[PDB]
Amino acid sequence: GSHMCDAFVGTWKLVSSENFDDYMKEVGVGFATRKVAGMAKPNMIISVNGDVITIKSESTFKNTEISFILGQEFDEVTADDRKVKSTITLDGGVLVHVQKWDGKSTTIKRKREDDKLVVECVMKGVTSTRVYERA
Numbered sequence: 001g002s003h004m005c006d007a008f009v010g011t012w013k014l015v016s017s018e019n020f021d022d023y024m025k026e027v028g029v030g031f032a033t034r035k036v037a038g039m040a041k042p043n044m045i046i047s048v049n050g051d052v053i054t055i056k057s058e059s060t061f062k063n064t065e066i067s068f069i070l071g072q073e074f075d076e077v078t079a080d081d082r083k084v085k086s087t088i089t090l091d092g093g094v095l096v097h098v099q100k101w102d103g104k105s106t107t108i109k110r111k112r113e114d115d116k117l118v119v120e121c122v123m124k125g126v127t128s129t130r131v132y133e134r135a
Ligand SMILES: O=S(=O)(Nc1cccc2nsnc12)c1cc(Cl)sc1Cl
Pocket: 037, 038, 040, 042, 057, 058, 059, 060, 061, 062, 063, 064, 078, 079, 080, 108, 119, 121, 130
């Protein structure tokens, strides 16, 4: 029957981005990767099988895939090749994804708003907003 993340499931295409270069700078991404990754128009493919959520992000730059159980820490290699420890939880209907590495932390929030999936990425004082629509 219906569950946790049903409204996230599907295939989503990036339609807008704001301040992603600044977010990537704050994270520590170098110039060439910022330029190529910032040009990308990834799709995001979200699926659920039991307790396991899978999020794939695919673009001309890279294809990434994470599978996880809410509240259970895992290893992630990010699109920019960081080796991070991640934990994803659901907080009042928002997927909250925290990445830890090198004594640093960033949080990515994914939420459904109208027909969009809105992604907010925060690294200290810098927020990037990325908006997806159904493919
Ligand atoms: O928007 S993303 O979800 N993923 C991607 C951004 C750009 C190019 C890509 N190719 S594959 N996945 C990609 C993203 C990557 C971070 Cl690093 S931070 C954060 Cl949000």
